[PDB]
Amino acid sequence: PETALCARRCQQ
Amino acid sequence: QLTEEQIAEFKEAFSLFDKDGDGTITTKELGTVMRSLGQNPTEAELQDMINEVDADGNGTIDFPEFLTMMARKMKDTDSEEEIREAFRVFDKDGNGYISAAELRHVMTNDEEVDEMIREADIDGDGQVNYEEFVQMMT
Amino acid sequence: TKAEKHVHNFMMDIQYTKEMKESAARVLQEAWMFYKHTRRKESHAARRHQRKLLAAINAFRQVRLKHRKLREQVNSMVDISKMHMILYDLQ
Amino acid sequence: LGALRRRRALFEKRKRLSDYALIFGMFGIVVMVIETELSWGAYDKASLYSLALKCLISLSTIILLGLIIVYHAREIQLFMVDNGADDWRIAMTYERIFFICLEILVCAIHPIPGNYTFTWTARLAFSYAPSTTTADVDIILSIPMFLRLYLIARVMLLHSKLFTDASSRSIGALNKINFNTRFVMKTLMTICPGTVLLVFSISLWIIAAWTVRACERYHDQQDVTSNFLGAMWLISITFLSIGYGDMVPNTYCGKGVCLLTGIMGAGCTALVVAVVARKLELTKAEKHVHNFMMDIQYTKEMKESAARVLQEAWMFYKHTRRKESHAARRHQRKLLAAINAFRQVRLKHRKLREQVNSMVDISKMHMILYDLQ
Amino acid sequence: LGALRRRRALFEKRKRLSDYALIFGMFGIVVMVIETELSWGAYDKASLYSLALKCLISLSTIILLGLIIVYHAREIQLFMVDNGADDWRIAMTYERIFFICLEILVCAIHPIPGNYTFTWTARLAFSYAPSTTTADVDIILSIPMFLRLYLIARVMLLHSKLFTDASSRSIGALNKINFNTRFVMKTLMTICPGTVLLVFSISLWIIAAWTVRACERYHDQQDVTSNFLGAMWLISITFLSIGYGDMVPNTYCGKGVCLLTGIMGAGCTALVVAVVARKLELTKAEKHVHNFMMDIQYTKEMKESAARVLQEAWMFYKHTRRKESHAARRHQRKLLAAINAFRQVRLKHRKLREQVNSMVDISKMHMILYDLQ
Amino acid sequence: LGALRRRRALFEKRKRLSDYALIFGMFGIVVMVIETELSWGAYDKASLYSLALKCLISLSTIILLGLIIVYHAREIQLFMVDNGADDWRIAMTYERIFFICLEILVCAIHPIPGNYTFTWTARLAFSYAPSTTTADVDIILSIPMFLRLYLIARVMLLHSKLFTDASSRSIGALNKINFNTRFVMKTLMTICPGTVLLVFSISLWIIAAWTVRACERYHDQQDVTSNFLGAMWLISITFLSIGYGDMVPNTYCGKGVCLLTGIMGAGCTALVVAVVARKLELTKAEKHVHNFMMDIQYTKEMKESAARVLQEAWMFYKHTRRKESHAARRHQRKLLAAINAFRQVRLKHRKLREQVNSMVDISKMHMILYDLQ
Ligand SMILES: [Ca+2]
Ligand SMILES: [Ca+2]
Ligand SMILES: [Ca+2]
Ligand SMILES: [Ca+2]
Ligand SMILES: [K+]
Ligand SMILES: [K+]
């Protein structure tokens, strides 16, 4: 994930 | 006797109920105070409620009688008023004397009520009055 | 609605009248039961029937007050209609 | 007079049948919740504890359907009494038959004994990665079982005191009042508006939390929305419309419960606020006491406000006569502020008197009319 | 008369004991906040600076419990004076004893001196990965200490002027009013409704933000929600039901405070709006001034609107007599527009007079009734 | 009469100075927006276009402060005229001096010419990674420049017709009305309640979106919330309290503006709903027309509803006499449904007539009182 939005959502 | 602050505040309340300052609460002053509070009391009810605390029967409430009324009304719940109201609702006919038939009727909502009548009729007049009701309540 | 409130307030008044009859019945029932045990010299029994009498008096006061509040609401809503009747009489 | 005895006998039978329809209706729901929870971990759907627990739901549904049929047989007979008919076919309208079939269809949806499965394919949330499971068919029949709660409303109506009392029927006929199920709802919202909304909110909380958990448990491998407290937190911020978004359902069943809760919680919170704002308002009798005590306070405040007006005016005069420029100016500012303060309290006393004379307007009209009589 | 001296004396002692229970009740809360914030970084839970600060909470709890016990003994003595009873046992009901023990239990939950630990296992948000930490047992006892804020309601009620004043007791007795804690709450929401909701909201903001930070600090290795300005942001977007969802608590403690803020904020914002909407409304004396000036303005507008009707009507005639087709056509479109503008102002003037006559209806009735006298 | 000429002379000077203070107050804000948006792009903070554009803000602040000082000197002179004082020192209270210095402090915050920088360390959102940048000192002095909008309220009050008109002042004195800035606010919310809430919402939209963009641009490299249309989309979903959470500001300046917009939007939408709900209500003159036409419709419905009652009653008799069991049964179901339909329209007509009498109650009272005269 380039941005932290994608890091947080793909983990949840 | 009551302290200075209590006497002062009771005098303030009495003067709130006594506009003319003559020292006695005429029934007109009590009526106009009640009307200023949103109630509409009739003359009959006003006179009935003014002689409850009128000890000497002069027809007006002086300071000692107002003090007695305040001592009765300062507590959150007054037992005398509730006993009087229970006696009123017991007296369907409104004559002031609850007959034995009414005493039996109010319990359906035989020997026990007869025992109550026997033990409450202190003067033996064949019926139960307000004084007998408060004596049995206490 | 304006007509369903009058029906509800009319049936509530009948309910409160019956509640006051049963609440005042308990006031005297516990008052005499207190007198019966007191005359029999039963300290604990009289004490319990004095707690019950005090609770019955408070319960009778509560139903008496809520009945008074209902009568205030009934009179407040029936004010202008009563005014019309008085005005017709003056004619 | 003959129809009065029959009508009362038939009403008692209808009330008794509605009580048994709620006993068996709620029993099947309770056993459904027990069987649903246990069939996940405790045993499997091919066990003898599931054939013996789904035969309790099935048997209760058979008896419940009999009580629904018999209840409507008493309603037909009551129709033939009120409307003075002799043939039951006169009561068979197209609306009554539709509602008879609707109640039967609603009350016949239960987990059938046997191990049946279907392929449930859902796309997860956020990642939107496909997931597939062989979910049982007993999950799409257990959720509709919550529709049997309509028997609660029928029981409340039939058990209502004014629905059958001859005192209320006679008074209601004078005002042309229909004692239908809407009237009971409206009277409940006037007697106990807060208790009805609190009971409904809590009941919807547990039921929606369990429904989301029961649907999400197939497509949840991290016990996130398939946990009871993870679904009771998911459906708590939808009722309040906070919508954090940290947890959302992965399926279209948990998304239909979040949607339903959002609609219900949008209106329930507004109705609760209306009830609360109506219980924090002084009554018409407590407003006369409050205004009476405020009037006494304002009269005493005007006595001390006007006293300061003259006290500072004379202190200004005393220092002016003594030829003290700084002191005279210091007390002239105090005199101006005292006059402004006296004006402020005089205006707020005027406002109170206007408010007092606005709530004793119609009542004063009654007094004048009584005098004219 | 004899019981008036003893009732006033026992009320003064009850009022004095209520003040001291708030002095020690709030002091223990303050020392709890100091010790909670300092035992994190400044020292450790097995220090002599923590055994000496947690013994101040313990010492203040013993004194607070003594003041609660003595206060309730004064209530028993007051009951025996009012009800006329002579034996304290007539006052010991099942409802009074339950509340005596409830206040003792609420006021006895404080951080006990010592170093006791428990294993706190939580699951971080947005990933639901396990996180286990050894947390002190003094964090599950510090949060309940905020339940001592119920003593503020007791102090407010006993210090209320109308609760004991003989002028208000007599006036309230005529209207059969009950001077309880609910009456004080309702009078507060009428006198200063915007000072009660603003103080409550700010106090809740500070208390809830600290409670969230205190719980969300054993399971926060990024200083996200364990920051005080990061806990105030969380509480504020939940109070206003925005719910960004960038920060949610990782523990059930923080999730419980955020759920309590959402419930309070749903109603507090709605109540505040109604306050700001009842203060932006013209009073009954300012509406009459506004309507008086509107009537003068509309009368002047009608004079100038009818002047334009005739001015364009004659301008149309002047050009028509001069045989100018285009000029007459242009002055007839203006005349029709002028007539429409004259109608619009005349209609809005009629609407205003309708409103003026609607407000002055019952007051005009009083004047007629006075004349008939 | 002499002070009447001086009071009107000083009021015209105050109105003239308030207009020029708003001209220069808004000029400094406009140049601030131009210089802020260009320093990021066209030129740098060390250029000759920034020394020449920040000297326009500084020069306009000097003139604006001069007009604020002179305006308050006119209010001091007007005080000495109204209150009949001879020394201005009697007009110098502690509240007036504080407010004079508060306005000067608010109006003196502008970007000083020169290149001063400070280190801005902020923690990004959703990742909480530190980001240190060398921000200019003219970003913490440009945002407070929006506090000069308080001059708009002063200009609206001083330009209001009823604030100075001798016709409105005389009428207001009879009703004891105070013509202050609160009265102007209340009259605006009654004349045009939707225009006031629509201009405020749109103006707040552009001002807050620019403030978010200006603050949240030193810590933005993906052009997400440093974009005007990205900031205008973040603010709108906070005003509506949707709160997607897709974009949240990274700074404390953008986080204090989203909170400010959330508070304002919580009440503005509630006030707007009330306005739109007070305009969809039929007026007292349109309700009488609607009720009159409904009464005509219901009377026509009763004629046709009772016609069907007898039509099916005879159709039942015709087939019964012809000995047609099925045909008679069908016409008895239709007769029963026709009777129920007749009852429903008769009940809804009775309800309308009751509603008509409820509104026409006091007007009927007036006619009776006129007759008694
Ligand atoms: Ca007198
Ligand atoms: Ca006397
Ligand atoms: Ca009798
Ligand atoms: Ca007797
Ligand atoms: K919302
Ligand atoms: K939201």
DSSP string, D163-205: GT-HHHHHHHHHTT---SHHHHHHHHHHHSHHHHHHHHHHHHH
E247, E234 Cβ separation under 8 angstroms: yes
F243, D243 Cβ separation under 8 angstroms: yes
Amino acid identity at D20: Y
F132 DSSP β-pair partners: F121
Alpha-carbon span F29 to F21, nearest angstrom: 12
Alpha-carbon span E196 to E277, nearest angstrom: 16
E262, E180 Cβ separation under 8 angstroms: no
D121 phi and psi, to 5 degrees?
A: -110, 115
Burial of E218 (0-12, 13-18, 19+ CB in 10 A): buried
E127 phi and psi, to 5 degrees?
A: -130, -20
CA E74, E76, E81: angle at the middle one, nearest 5? 95
D247, D233 Cβ separation under 8 angstroms: yes
Alpha-carbon span F8 to E134, nearest angstrom: 77
Q: Is F242 close to E242, i.e. CB distance below 8 A?
A: yes
F45 phi and psi, to 5 degrees?
A: -75, -10
- Which ranges of chain D would DSSP assign to H, the alpha helix? 2-41, 48-51, 54-82, 94-107, 150-158, 166-174, 181-191, 193-216, 228-234, 254-279, 284-321, 325-359, 361-372
| Chain D residues within an 8 Å CB radius of E236 | none
| Tokens encoding E46 | 């097995």
Q: For strand F130-136 and strand F117-123, is the pairing parallel, antiparallel, or unpaired?
A: antiparallel
Q: Which of B76, B87, B109 to mutate to test the interface with C (most CBs of C within 10 A)?
A: B109
Amino acid identity at D287: K
Return the closest-CA partner of residue E139 out of E54, E228, E56. Answer: E54
Question: HSE (CB half, 13 Å, CA atoms) of B110?
Answer: 0
Amino acid identity at E317: Y
User: 3-state class of E244 per DSSP?
Assistant: coil
Amino acid identity at B40: N
Amino acid identity at E271: L
F244, F223 Cβ separation under 8 angstroms: no
F67, F17 Cβ separation under 8 angstroms: yes
Alpha-carbon span D177 to D156, nearest angstrom: 18
The DSSP line for D247-306 is S--SSTTHHHHHHHHHHHHHHHHHHHHHHHHHHSS--HHHHHHHHHHHHHHHHHHHHHHH
Resolution value (Å, 1 decimal): 3.2
Return the closest-CA partner of residue D37 out of D227, D184, D316, D221. Answer: D227
Q: Helix, strand, coil % (nearest 5) of chain E?
A: 75, 5, 20
CA C7, C10, C13: angle at the middle one, nearest 5? 150
F253, F260 Cβ separation under 8 angstroms: no
Q: Is E128 close to A8, i.e. CB distance below 8 A?
A: no
Angle formed by the axes of helices E325-359 and F284-321, nearest 10°: 80
Tell me, yes or no, if A3 comes closer than 8 A to chain E by beta carbon: no
- Which residues fall inside 5 Å of ion ligand 1, going by CB? B 18, 20, 22, 26
Ligand 2 centroid – CA B63 distance (Å) = 8
CA C46 to chain CA mean position, Å: 26
Report, at the CATH architecture level, how domain B3-76 is classified.
Answer: Orthogonal Bundle (1.10)
Neighbours of F105 (CB within 10 A): 11
Burial of E147 (0-12, 13-18, 19+ CB in 10 A): middle
Neighbours of E341 (CB within 10 A): 16
Return the closest-CA partner of residue F235 out of E242, D245, E229, D241. Answer: E242
User: 3-state class of D134 per DSSP?
Assistant: coil
| Chain D residues within an 8 Å CB radius of B37 | 288-289, 292
Burial of F170 (0-12, 13-18, 19+ CB in 10 A): exposed
E133 DSSP β-pair partners: E120
Structural determination approach: cryo-EM
Tell me, yes or no, if D267 comes closer than 8 A to chain F by beta carbon: no
Only one residue has tokens 């409304």, namely E281
Alpha-carbon span D154 to D214, nearest angstrom: 28
Contacts of E108 (CB under 8 A, 6+ apart): E61, E65
Question: HSE (CB half, 13 Å, CA atoms) of F209?
Answer: 19
Report the gap between the CA of D88 and the closest CA in chain F (Å).
10
D258, D249 Cβ separation under 8 angstroms: yes
The chain A residue lying nearest D129, using CA atoms, is A10
Amino acid identity at E132: T
Only one residue has tokens 């290795």, namely E221
Contacts of B64 (CB under 8 A, 6+ apart): B55
Neighbours of F213 (CB within 10 A): 24
User: 3-state class of E111 per DSSP?
Assistant: coil
- Please give the DSSP secondary-structure letter assigned to residue E89: G
C49, C30 Cβ separation under 8 angstroms: yes
Contacts of D174 (CB under 8 A, 6+ apart): none
Report the gap between the CA of D363 and the closest CA in chain B (Å).
8
F246, F265 Cβ separation under 8 angstroms: no
Return the closest-CA partner of residue D347 out of E91, F178, E315, F11. Answer: F178
Q: Is C51 close to E176, i.e. CB distance below 8 A?
A: no
F142, F36 Cβ separation under 8 angstroms: yes
DSSP run (H or E) holding D92 = none
D117 DSSP β-pair partners: D136
- Please give the DSSP secondary-structure letter assigned to residue B62: -
Relative to the alpha carbon of B96, which ligand is closest?
Answer: 3
CA E68, E70, E76: angle at the middle one, nearest 5? 105
Q: Is B40 close to D367, i.e. CB distance below 8 A?
A: yes
- Return the HEC string of E184-198: HHHHHHHHCHHHHHH
E351 phi and psi, to 5 degrees?
A: -65, -40
CA E136 to chain CA mean position, Å: 35
| Tokens encoding D185 | 């709802």
Q: Is D171 close to C72, i.e. CB distance below 8 A?
A: no
| Tokens encoding D39 | 């069939």
| Chain C residues within an 8 Å CB radius of E83 | 54
Alpha-carbon span E212 to E249, nearest angstrom: 8
**What are the E-state strand segments in B6-134?**
none
Ligand 4 centroid – CA C45 distance (Å) = 27
CA E276, E278, E280: angle at the middle one, nearest 5? 70
Q: Is D336 close to F176, i.e. CB distance below 8 A?
A: no
F130 DSSP β-pair partners: F123
Only one residue has tokens 């008879």, namely D100
F258, F238 Cβ separation under 8 angstroms: yes
Alpha-carbon span D103 to D148, nearest angstrom: 9
CA distance readout (Å), F77 to D336, F85, F94, F113:
16, 9, 17, 36
Contacts of F68 (CB under 8 A, 6+ apart): F21, F103, F104, F107
The DSSP line for C5-72 is HHHHHHHHHHHHHHHHHHHHHHHHHHHHHHHHHHHTT-HHHHHHHHHHHHHHHHHHHHHHHHHHHHHH
- Please give the DSSP secondary-structure letter assigned to residue D121: E
F113, F141 Cβ separation under 8 angstroms: no
Tell me, yes or no, if F343 comes closer than 8 A to chain D by beta carbon: no
B62, B15 Cβ separation under 8 angstroms: no
The DSSP line for E20-70 is HHHHHHHHHHHHHHHHHHHHHHTS-TTSHHHHTTHHHHHHHHHHHHHHHHH
D342, D302 Cβ separation under 8 angstroms: yes
Which of F361, F369, F372 lies nearest to residue C80, judging by beta carbons? Answer: F361
Burial of E289 (0-12, 13-18, 19+ CB in 10 A): buried
| Chain E residues within an 8 Å CB radius of A11 | 126-127
F349, F291 Cβ separation under 8 angstroms: no
Alpha-carbon span D7 to D10, nearest angstrom: 5
CA F78 to chain CA mean position, Å: 32
A10, D127 Cβ separation under 8 angstroms: yes
Alpha-carbon span F153 to D150, nearest angstrom: 58
User: 3-state class of E133 per DSSP?
Assistant: strand
Amino acid identity at C15: Q
D136 DSSP β-pair partners: D117
Question: HSE (CB half, 13 Å, CA atoms) of E300?
Answer: 6
CA F25, F28, F33: angle at the middle one, nearest 5? 130
Do C and A make contact via 3 or more CB pairs under 8 A? The reply is no
End-to-end CA distance of chain C: 31
Give the CA-trace dihedral at B47, B48, B49, B50, to 10 degrees: 40
E45, E136 Cβ separation under 8 angstroms: yes
Do F and B make contact via 3 or more CB pairs under 8 A? The reply is no
Alpha-carbon span B126 to B54, nearest angstrom: 29
Give start-end residues of each CATH 1.10.238.10 domain in chain B.
3-76, 77-137
Gaps in chain B (C to N distance exceeding 2.5 A) after: 109
Relative to the alpha carbon of B56, which ligand is closest?
Answer: 2
Alpha-carbon span C48 to D33, nearest angstrom: 47
**D301-330 residues labelled b (16+ CB within 10 A) or e (exposed):** beeebbebbeebbebbeebeeeeeeeebbe
Alpha-carbon span E166 to E156, nearest angstrom: 18
Report the gap between the CA of A11 and the closest CA in chain E (Å).
5
Alpha-carbon span D62 to D46, nearest angstrom: 23
Alpha-carbon span C6 to D175, nearest angstrom: 8
User: 3-state class of D99 per DSSP?
Assistant: helix
E136 DSSP β-pair partners: E117
Q: Is D243 close to E238, i.e. CB distance below 8 A?
A: no
Relative to the alpha carbon of B63, which ligand is closest?
Answer: 2
> Which residues of B are documented as binding site for Ca(2+)?
18, 20, 22, 24, 29, 54, 56, 58, 60, 65, 91, 93, 95, 97, 102, 121, 123, 125, 127, 132
| Chain B residues within an 8 Å CB radius of D289 | 37
E335, E313 Cβ separation under 8 angstroms: yes
Alpha-carbon span D205 to D235, nearest angstrom: 7
User: 3-state class of E273 per DSSP?
Assistant: helix
Radius of gyration of chain C from Cα atoms? 21
Question: HSE (CB half, 13 Å, CA atoms) of D316?
Answer: 16
Return the closest-CA partner of residue F266 out of D270, E269, E275. Answer: E269
Alpha-carbon span F252 to E180, nearest angstrom: 45
Sort residue D222 into left (φ over 0), alpha (ψ -120 to 50) or beta.
Answer: alpha
Only one residue has tokens 């006369």, namely D288
CA D28 to chain CA mean position, Å: 25
Q: Is F372 close to C84, i.e. CB distance below 8 A?
A: no
CATH of domain B77-137: 1.10.238.10
Amino acid identity at F168: S
DSSP run (H or E) holding F216 = none
Alpha-carbon span B15 to F313, nearest angstrom: 78
CA distance readout (Å), B129 to B86, B133, C22, D302, F168:
12, 6, 20, 52, 70
Amino acid identity at F141: L
Alpha-carbon span F72 to F17, nearest angstrom: 10
Gaps in chain C (C to N distance exceeding 2.5 A) after: none
F119 DSSP β-pair partners: F134
CA distance readout (Å), E79 to D58, E7, E304, F92:
61, 9, 77, 57
Question: HSE (CB half, 13 Å, CA atoms) of E113?
Answer: 15
Return the closest-CA partner of residue C32 out of E77, E95, B126, B90. Answer: B90
Alpha-carbon span D20 to D65, nearest angstrom: 11
Q: Is F241 close to E244, i.e. CB distance below 8 A?
A: no
Report the gap between the CA of B121 and the closest CA in chain E (Å).
25
Amino acid identity at E67: L
D239 phi and psi, to 5 degrees?
A: -60, -45
Sort residue E112 into left (φ over 0), alpha (ψ -120 to 50) or beta.
Answer: beta
| Chain E residues within an 8 Å CB radius of A3 | none
The DSSP line for F278-311 is HSSSPPHHHHHHHHHHHHHHHHHHHHHHHHHHHH
- Please give the DSSP secondary-structure letter assigned to residue E129: -
Q: Which of E255, E268, E361, E368 to mutate to test the interface with D (most CBs of D within 10 A)?
A: E255
Return the closest-CA partner of residue D85 out of D96, D72, D75. Answer: D75
| Chain A residues within an 8 Å CB radius of F246 | 5
Only one residue has tokens 């970007």, namely F111
Return the closest-CA partner of residue D91 out of D17, F339, D99, D83. Answer: D83
Report the gap between the CA of E339 and the closest CA in chain F (Å).
23
Neighbours of B58 (CB within 10 A): 11
Alpha-carbon span B56 to F18, nearest angstrom: 75
Alpha-carbon span E144 to E150, nearest angstrom: 12
